[model samples]
Target: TRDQNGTWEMESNENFEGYMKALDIDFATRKIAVRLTQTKVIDQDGDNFKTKTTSTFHHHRNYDVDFTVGVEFDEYTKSLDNRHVKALVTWEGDVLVCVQKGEKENRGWKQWIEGDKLYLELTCGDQVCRQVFKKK
Candidate 1:
């Protein structure tokens, strides 16, 4: 396990190009986004954890995880901040499930652990995008 203030940084390198493209991100912005490094830091407190994701060219998010439940921080996610969406998170066994309600119908993500890797699935409309991150 990582320390509370330790940072887990990843440079998109290659995977993010298709990742952002799948999200319908514009071509011009994707060029810059794919080249930047993204930093994710997790701060643990007892059974609760706070995480912050930062990037030089895009928006960031700060949220908390406690037990098997989580909630939006009001100021973090773009959907919550811009579209006035409400997000809810819960766990099913080992999977972390999220449901975001707003203009886009059936939008959310699910996270889970498999061996030493973390799996994420992001969904919006009819699209379901998957990503994986190895523990650092």
Candidate 2:
């Protein structure tokens, strides 16, 4: 099993503005979000997982997800626009793919690790934002 229990800091981001725009995020928020240094703290134990996405500008957003592959549950995201949605997370080999169903047509994120780096793909509508993070 791929163990994802460490702190990861953002290295690069692509198409982040497009992704945020799809969510109707204001220009000011998008500006800060796109430039802010992001850090992810992940703790995974069996089927339970906890993740904190933090930035010096817009600080902590914690996600507590407990699920098995193919299981769907209700998730309330307080930060990043404050939305409640039905979320499903499944494992595709070593990658964790998540699909969030709500107001937006297509919105979700996928995460995987490569060597000492972590890759995150955030999607909304037709926009896809790719972020690379280095383990810290």
Candidate 3:
């Protein structure tokens, strides 16, 4: 039962290039994505969640999903890569875990808030990318 709100700025990133490569993102886009600083604006209202990922190169990559804990739904991701996948989001203690089922193996992301920091763990294929964000 975590309420994720407000703007979060990226502080650190790890293995991001590897993760993007696994997704088959173009080299040009990956280069820009790696260099740009990302900021996430999240608004959560009960089971409804809206998130906007912004960067200098790209203004907004929006994601809107609605689901209760333990429920699964199909989610369309357009920003990172144009693909459709089944997404299941569940809460494990204070952590919000997401498992995305699609063509790629082990594709998902986990988000958790600790103090004033938000941690995002993104997985694709066998690569994992860790991104740390601070509430602004």
lDDT of each: 0.53, 0.78, 0.79
Runs of candidate 1 with Cα error greater than 4 angstroms are 1-37, 44-47, 56-81
Give the least accurate 10-residue stretch of model 3, judged by summed lDDT.
Answer: 55-64
> Which whole-number lDDT from 0 to 100 does residue 22 have in model 1?
42
- Looking at candidate 2, the ten consecutive residues that score lowest on lDDT are 55-64
TM-score of structure candidate 1: 0.60
Q: After superposition, how far is residue 88 of candidate 3 from its true place, in Å?
A: 0.9
Could you give candidate 2's per-residue lDDT for residues 8-28 as a string of tens digits?
999998988688778886454
TM-score of each: 0.60, 0.83, 0.82
RMSD (Å) per prediction: 5.3, 2.8, 2.7
Candidate with the greatest lDDT versus the true structure = 3
Ranking 2 against 3 by lDDT, winner: 3
User: Model 1 scores what on Cα lDDT?
Assistant: 0.53
| lDDT comparing candidate 3 with the true structure | 0.79
Clash tally, candidates in order: 0, 0, 0
Candidate 2, TM-score vs. the true structure? 0.83
